[PDB]
Amino acid sequence: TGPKAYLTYSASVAVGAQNGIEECKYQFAWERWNCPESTLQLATHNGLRSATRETSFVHAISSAGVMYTLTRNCSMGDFDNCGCDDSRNGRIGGRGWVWGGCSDNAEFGERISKLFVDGLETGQDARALMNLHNNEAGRLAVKETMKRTCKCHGISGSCSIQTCWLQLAEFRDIGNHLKIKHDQALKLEMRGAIADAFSSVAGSELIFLEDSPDYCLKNISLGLQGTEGRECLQSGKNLSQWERRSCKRLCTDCGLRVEEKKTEIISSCNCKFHWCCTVKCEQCKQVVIKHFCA
Amino acid sequence: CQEITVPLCKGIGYNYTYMPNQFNHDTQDEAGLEVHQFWPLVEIQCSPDLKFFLCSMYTPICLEDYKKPLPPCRSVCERAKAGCAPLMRQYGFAWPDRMRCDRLPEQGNPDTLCMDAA
Ligand SMILES: *[C@@H]1O[C@H](CO)[C@@H](O[C@@H]2O[C@H](CO)[C@@H](O[C@@H]3O[C@H](CO)[C@@H](O)[C@H](O[C@H]4O[C@H](CO)[C@@H](O)[C@H](O)[C@@H]4O)[C@@H]3O)[C@H](O)[C@H]2NC(C)=O)[C@H](O)[C@H]1NC(C)=O
Ligand SMILES: *[C@@H]1O[C@H](CO[C@@H]2O[C@@H](C)[C@@H](O)[C@@H](O)[C@@H]2O)[C@@H](O[C@@H]2O[C@H](CO)[C@@H](O[C@@H]3O[C@H](CO)[C@@H](O)[C@H](O)[C@@H]3O)[C@H](O)[C@H]2NC(C)=O)[C@H](O)[C@H]1NC(C)=O
Ligand SMILES: *[C@@H]1O[C@H](CO)[C@@H](O[C@@H]2O[C@H](CO)[C@@H](O)[C@H](O)[C@H]2NC(C)=O)[C@H](O)[C@H]1NC(C)=O
Ligand SMILES: [Zn+2]
Ligand SMILES: [Zn+2]
Ligand SMILES: [Zn+2]
C-alpha cells in the first residue's frame, strides 16, 4: 500500500468503477431511481449518505466493477507483476479434459478492489460497516459467477479431448445477479453489539438501514432529481411488460403527463451482400418517436 | 482486422480475418493446426465449397465497413456436407458438430445476413 502501487493501478481502477456505475445505470434504466450516481460520488459519498436499499447496490456493483475489470486487466497483458492463475494448470480435472489456458486471477482483482473501494469507506461507524459489507457482497458475486470455459482440441475439433480454464462471467450477468441481490436485500435494526448483527447476515446478501425515499419526488438534499423529464417506453414490438409500463410507472403514477418527441436519426440499413469479399450498406433517415415525463 | 496467415485459406476471396473466431481460437496458427486436418478433403475436392466453408468458419471475414460477423449461408454448408460427409463417413469420421448447418442463417433475410451463391 505505497503511493507507487496506488498510482500504477489507479487508472485501471477508475475505468472499473465507471463500468460498475454504467451497469448500475443499465439495471435501473427504467426505474424511478435510475442510478443518478457519479464515479466521484462514491468517494465524496455525496448523493449516497442515505443507507437506503439502492445505495447498497451502488457499493456492490462498483466494487464488483473494480475487481472485474482489473482481474481482466491482470489476465490480459496489462500488468507485468501478475501473471494469471498458473496454479492447478496442467492437472487433470475430469474425464477427457485437462486444465490449462489462462484462468483469470480473481484473487488479484479482489486484492485491488479492497484497496481502493473499501478504502473510501472511512469511519468505524455502523454505516461504514454496512458499506464495507456490500462491497464484498458484489466482490464475491464476481467470484462465484466464474465458470469453466473450454476449447475443443480433439481430432477435427471433436470435444473428445479438451483444455479448460476458469473464466469470468459476463459483467452483465453479474449485474443481473446483483440486481436480484438488491431486490431481495433486507433491512437491519441495531459497539460490538452492532458488529454482531452484521455477521448474522450472509456475505452475499445486501444490507441497508434506512427506508428508501419516494423516488417520484425531487429531493436535492439527497441528490435525487425527480422523475420529470425522463424518457419512458410506450410502444415496442418486443418490450418486457415491465418496459411497457415505464410510462405509467415513471410518469402518470408520479402525477406527470406523457409527451412525445419526434427524433430523426441516421442509421446504416437495407444492407445487401455482393458476391465475395464485400458488403455495401447504404444509410437511411429514420423517424423514432420518443416519450418522456413532463 | 488482421491478415490471413494460414495456407489453406489464402486467396479464397478475402485477405483479412479477425480473432478470436467462432471456434474461440487465439492465433491463426492455432486455428491452422486444426483446419489442416481437413487438407485431404480439399485435395479430393469432394466439394468445391469446402475450402471456402472451412475458411469462413476458422478464419471468418473481417471488414472495415461492416463490423458485425458474417457467416456462410446454410446452403454453402449443406453442399460441403453433401459432398464430404459420405466420404468421411466411410472412414469413421462423423461430420463435426461445429460444422452443423442449422446453426447457420438461411439466405434471404435482412436480419440474417450471410455469404452464398445468388
Ligand atoms: C485495464 O483494462 C481496461 C479495460 O478493461 C483498460 O481500459 C481501456 O484502455 C484503453 C487504452 O487506453 C482505452 O482505449 C482507448 O479508447 C479511446 C476512446 O475513448 C481511443 O481513442 C483510444 O485510441 C487510442 O489508440 C488508437 C490506436 O492506436 C488511436 O487511434 C487513438 O488516437 C488513441 O491513441 C483507445 O483505444 C479504453 O478507453 C479504456 N477503457 C475505458 C476508459 O473505459 C485500461 O487501460 C487497462 N489498463 C492497462 C494497464 O492497460
Ligand atoms: C428530503 O429527504 C429528507 C430525508 O428523508 C428521510 O430520510 C430518507 C433517507 C428516507 O428515509 C425518508 O423517508 C425520510 O423522510 C426529508 O426530511 C425528513 O422529513 C420527514 C417529514 O416529512 C421527517 O420525519 C419526521 O421525523 C420526526 C423525528 O425527528 C418525527 O417526529 C416526525 O413524525 C416525522 O416522522 C424526517 O425527520 C426528515 N429528515 C431529516 C432529518 O431531514 C425531506 O422530507 C425531503 N425533502 C424534500 C425536498 O422532500
Ligand atoms: C489479397 O492479396 C492478393 C495478393 O496481393 C491479391 O491478389 C492479387 O495480387 C496481385 C499481386 O500479387 C495483384 O497484382 C492483383 O491485383 C491481385 N488480384 C486481384 C484480385 O486483382 C488480392 O487482390 C487481394 N484481395 C483483396 C481483398 O483485394
Ligand atoms: Zn461508499
Ligand atoms: Zn446469479
Ligand atoms: Zn405515443
CATH code of the domain containing A275: 3.30.2460.20
**Number of domains observed in the structure of chain B:** 1
- Can you give the residue range of the structural domain that contains A183? 1-226
Ligand 3 geometric centre to CA of B13 (Å)? 10
Taking CB atoms and an 8 Å cut-off, how many pairs form between chains A and B?
44
Q: Are residues A263 and A217 in the same domain?
A: no
Q: Which residues pair with A287 in a beta bridge?
A: A264
Which ligand neighbours the alpha carbon of A131 most closely?
4
Q: Are residues A210 and A242 in the same domain?
A: no
Q: Is the CB of B15 under 6 A from ligand 3?
A: yes
Residue whose C-alpha cell reads 490480459 in the numeric block: A76
Given the DSSP bridges, would you call strands B16-17 and B2-3 parallel, antiparallel or unpaired?
antiparallel
The atom number, within ligand 2, closest to the CA of A224 reads: 1
The cell numbers describing A170, all together, are: 459476463
Nearest to A174 by CA among A213, A147, A208, A212: A147
Residues A235 and A214 in one domain: no
Task: Determine the residue of chain A that is closest to B21 in CA distance.
Answer: A151
> For an interface test with A, which of B57, B58, B98, B114 has the most A Cβ atoms less than 10 Å from its Cβ?
B98
Question: Does the annotation place B90 within a ligand binding site?
Answer: no
Q: Could you tell me which residues are beta bridge partners of residue A280?
A: A272
Method of determination used here: X-ray
Q: Which residues contact A181 (CB under 8 A, 6 or more apart)?
A: A57, A60, A137, A141, A204, A205, A206
Put simply, the chain B residues between 79 and 118 with a CB less than 8 A from any chain A CB are: 93, 96-98, 110, 113-115, 117-118
Q: Can you give the resolution of this entry in Å?
A: 3.2
Which positions ≥6 away from A259 have C-beta within 8 Å? A291, A292, A293, A294
CA of A56 to the centre of ligand 5 (A): 17
Q: What own/partner pairs with CB < 8 Å and gap ≥ 24 does A245-252 have?
A: A246/A30, A247/A291, A249/A30, A249/A31, A249/A32, A250/A30, A250/A32, A250/A293, A251/A227, A251/A292, A251/A293
- Domain limits at B28? 1-118
**8 A C-beta contact, residue B78 and residue B49:** no
Where does a domain end: A226, A243, A278? Answer: A226
Same domain membership, residue A204 and residue A179: yes
Q: Is there a single domain that holds both residue A53 and residue A196?
A: yes
Q: Count of domains in chain A?
A: 2
**Same-domain pairing of A203 and A186:** yes
Is ligand 3 within 6 A of the CB of residue B14? yes
Say whether both A205 and A237 belong to one domain: no
**A76: how many CB neighbours lie within 10 A of its CB?**
10
B41 annotated among ligand-binding-site residues: yes
Same structural domain, A44 and A6: yes
3-class DSSP assignment, residue B19: coil
**Dihedral, CA atoms, A223, A229, A233, A235, nearest 10 degrees?**
180
- Find the closest chain B residue to A276 by CA distance: B13
CATH number, domain of B8, equals 1.10.2000.10
Does A278 lie in the same domain as A149? no
Query: What are the phi and psi torsion angles at B17 (to 5°)?
Result: -130, 165
B35 labeled binding residue: no
Which of A210, A226, A242 is where one domain is finished?
Answer: A226
Cell of A266: 441516421
Task: Say yes or no: A97 and A190 in one domain.
Answer: yes
Do A148 and A41 lie in one domain? The reply is yes
Distance CA A202, CA A58 (A): 18
Q: At what angle do helices B28-35 and B50-58 cross, to 10 degrees?
A: 150
SS (H, E, C) chain A: CCHHHHHHHHHHHHHHHHHHHHHHHHHCCCCCCCCCCCCCHHHHCCCCCCCCHHHHHHHHHHHHHHHHHHHHHHHCCCCCCCCCCCCCCCCEEECCEEECCCCCCHHHHHHHHHHHHHHHCCCCCHHHHHHHHHHHHHHHHHHHCCEEEEEECCHHHCCCCEEEEEECCCHHHHHHHHHHHHHCCEECCCCHHHHHHHHCCCCCCCEECCCCCCCCCEECCCCEECCCCCEECCCCCCCCHHHHCHHHHHHHHHCCCEEEEEEEEEEECCCECCCCCCCECCEEEEEEEEEEEC
How far A75 CA sits from the closest chain B CA (Å)? 14
- Chain B neighbors of A271, CB-CB under 8 A: 66, 110, 113
Please check if B95 is assigned to a binding site. Answer: no
Which residue from A157, A275, A277 is facing B96, i.e. has the nearest CB? A157
- What is the Cα–Cα distance from B109 to A96, expressed in whole angstroms? 40
Same domain? For A178 and A231 the reply is no
